[PDB]
Amino acid sequence: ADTCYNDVALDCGITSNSLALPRCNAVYGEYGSHGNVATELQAYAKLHLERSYDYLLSAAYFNNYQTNRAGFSKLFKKLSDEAWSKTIDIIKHVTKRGDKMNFDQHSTMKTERKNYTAENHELEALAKALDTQKELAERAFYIHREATRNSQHLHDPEIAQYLEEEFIEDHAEKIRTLAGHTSDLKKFITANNGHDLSLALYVFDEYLQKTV
């Protein structure tokens, strides 16, 4: 059983001429040794980073003079700021657990390839926001399962509790909110032959300005 104390005893001996101390790091519970939890967490920071900029572009698009939807723009700006903040938080968690961030790490979770386009009408934009938030949420479920269930030799409840507290609880609220927005728009489009659509989009945008 290698320990940091034993590494010190060995290397601090007059016989030694170095001080490697490989066990004197923050790694415990074999974090990073078994399973894919460590690399998946790095890829999760990368997903938040990419989405933060996708949301930023949507916020910009809704703030052009033709669309001019301050409420939709505010909704996306908030999603962007939150994803940017989470990117940094995950990077710090990766290093807190004794690993190092690799910005080119890929996830093993088989996820289809669909480019994010910022130029969308209101319903399309909310639908894409809903899909991307569900993807972030299901990725957290995947990492959580990898940490506490998929590998016989890996059990990391620290990562599980971190995901539960910092990601999982709030994902349900965001997804429910976005799903509700798509239902509202769907009704504006279909009821009474969609006759109130333009006034409804204006009223809905004003509502977002007050509630986002």
Note the residues at the interface with a second copy (CB under 8 A): 1, 3-5, 7-9, 12, 18-19, 21, 24-26, 28-29, 95-98, 112, 114, 121, 123-124, 127-128, 130-131, 134, 137-138, 140-141, 144-145, 148-149, 155-158, 160-165, 168-169, 171-173, 175-176, 179-180, 182-183, 186, 189-190
Partner that binds at residue 3, options a second copy, other proteins, Ca ion, none, CB closer than 5 to 8 Å by kind: a second copy
Element housing 4 (H / E): helix 4-11
Question: ∠ CA 92-94-98 to the nearest 5 degrees?
Answer: 110
* Nearest Cα residue to 208 out of 62, 50, 64: 62
How far apart, in whole angstroms, are the C-alpha atoms of residue 150 and residue 84? 29
Residue that the structure tokens 């033709």 belong to? 66
**Residue 119 sits in the site that holds other proteins (CB under 8 A):** yes
Partner that binds at residue 4, options Ca ion, a second copy, other proteins, none, CB closer than 5 to 8 Å by kind: a second copy
Interface residues toward Ca ion, by CB under 5 A: 161, 164
Among 44, 61, 72, 167, binds other proteins (CB under 8 A): 61
- CA dihedral angle for residue 146, residue 148, residue 149, residue 154, rounded to 10 degrees: 80
**Residue 49 sits in the site that holds other proteins (CB under 8 A):** yes
Task: Between 52 and 133, name the residue whose CB sits nearer to a second copy.
Answer: 133
**Residue 212 sits in the site that holds other proteins (CB under 8 A):** no
Residues whose CB is less than 8 angstroms from the CB of residue 205 and which lie 6 or more positions away in sequence, other chains included:
69, 70, 71, 72
